[PDB]
Structure 1
């Protein structure tokens, strides 16, 4: 089992769901306390389990697995023995964890804001709604739409959104294309938002495109909020006899950068952090969603496909459905 998540296939569904979920609770809690290192280890340990070919039944099976030390092994051992891990359950029912989770789920609120509100004594959404003067416009939008934004986005929703985005893109720039990215491109059947990547086959024609797309969506009455090359929107999506708010991300890239942006925006988040870590630490190359840089020769790699990028980095190709680290 290789040590980096980008070196192994990770399918969406797997054979250690309960164990991975417990470790991801501890990862999330570490993040709420500002410990990114512990968050990463627990996330990586969870991802290792997702990549295994069968269920872990006995502690012996963790021997030699990367990112399993005394702490993560004890969590698994307790789950195997007792069906529950006392530490995990303590986190789950803690006021700190529950409140940090509720607040950080709000669009516009991160760990730092949530933590300060927690220290001020705030605990519920209505607590925040009682003094709206201190909220940002982004936070006001996230709070007003929080209930809708908590309901899973379905595949049917995605197909409907893509058609309306394509119509606005077509008027903004004939020939421009729309690609579904994020978790739905990895095969997820539900999600918290929809991610789209927009380009044009003629290099440079995409310049200035996103403002033109947003204006046309806004004049169609589809934009509840927005909020350049990345737009974090809230869309009004029709429903049977009504509608619901849905988070949509629209991102533009020139065709020269499209493979890097496609790779980055398809994720998973952990997969891309690991891929960038692998690139720099093992290959001496600097990767982002714009390109791949050799700092020794001071040159950018040209890529025409995701396959090109995996080849550049010396990695076996993984389709999106195997990037669910």
Structure 2
């Protein structure tokens, strides 16, 4: 079978046979991410990712005897799961207070490690003592992250997801009827839930100016109707010929939308009417659209390896907008995702086989 070490040469759907180990590794892994420990975090991810791809549940250390990205520091945490049935380590981090406050604080829109650590040291340990504290100061992001904390913690359905997609179209389609709005990210990977609904937008006719102002024009429109609860519009920071660095994104746009419950058709058929929704819009040149999709579809690990594989194996540089060959000193183009995979010389993996 020979299991590639790269997630991009692996098929990882949503059929995990090793959640037991997986959530242990993601916990331990996510802990080093909060522990500013960039190195061990990697280890756990590679390992966790790998397992998520296995077609069977590991029931003994013998089953490990082949898989890659399986280091000692790890098999030891694995061996504990196999026996105890649970993880002493994993369980520990769960109780660690620093961890717990970092997760909890960080779970607020506008809150990252910086501000997370800030509040920790100040002795804060809850979001109630944080909001109420008549001293601290908050960004508009944090105000918005807090103001709608409740709904944002809640997952987002495909119903709700699709519900948003209509909205994102009736708008975009209005200012650029020759534009394609495709849902990206996790839902595009086959997931039943997610925390933000992503969309990549592109247009053939779209001009520089047009493809630019479009994003404002849409949010304007949402503002005029009280659906825009938050909005941050970063202008593109990409030059066309700026090869993949060994930031730099298109005009993206983070925001919270007011999803009116009446527009969501689900098996469920109220208090406010609506639900706050995190939404990301990415605008992109029609000619680079194939890299943005590959760039905006899952997953961290898939994207992570796609890149290291690209470099370390093909002396090529993959981007969210280009694919440069350092050898042929030429920029490869792709009218599709399949082409890109083709270029890197990889069997095509589907969006749902990308949940590495």
Displacement after TM superposition at 1:283 (Å): 1.0
Contact 2:176 2:206 in 1 (8 A): no
2:63 maps to which residue? Answer: 61
SS in structure 1 opposite 2:159? helix
Residues in 2 aligned to 1:135 and 1:179: alpha-carbon distance in whole angstroms: 34
Q: Does 1:266 align with 2:306?
A: no
1:135 to 118, 133, 138: 138
2:267 maps to which residue? Answer: none
Displacement after TM superposition at 1:174 (Å): 2.0
2:254 maps to which residue? Answer: 232
Contact 1:203 1:256 in 2 (8 A): no
SS in structure 2 opposite 1:233? strand
SS in structure 2 opposite 1:191? coil
Residues in 2 aligned to 1:213 and 1:254: alpha-carbon distance in whole angstroms: 17
Displacement after TM superposition at 1:133 (Å): 4.8
1:218 to 213, 219, 223: 223
Residues in 1 aligned to 2:289 and 2:5: alpha-carbon distance in whole angstroms: 28
1:174 maps to which residue? Answer: 177
1:114 maps to which residue? Answer: 116
2:333 to 302, 305, 309: 302
Structure 1 residues 1-325: aligned runs within 5 Å? 1-129=3-131, 130-131=133-134, 133-202=136-205, 204=207, 206-227=211-232, 228=235, 229-239=251-261, 240=270, 242-325=273-356
Residues in 2 aligned to 1:179 and 1:249: alpha-carbon distance in whole angstroms: 12
Q: TM-score, normalised by structure 1?
A: 0.96
What residue ranges of structure 2 are gaps of 5+ in the alignment? 236-250, 262-269
CA RMSD of aligned residues (A): 1.4
Question: How many equivalent pairs are there?
Answer: 325
Residues in 2 aligned to 1:111 and 1:31: alpha-carbon distance in whole angstroms: 9
Residues in 1 aligned to 2:121 and 2:328: alpha-carbon distance in whole angstroms: 50
Q: TM-score, normalised by structure 2?
A: 0.88
Residues in 2 aligned to 1:134 and 1:221: alpha-carbon distance in whole angstroms: 26
Residues in 2 aligned to 1:213 and 1:301: alpha-carbon distance in whole angstroms: 32
SS in structure 1 opposite 2:280? strand
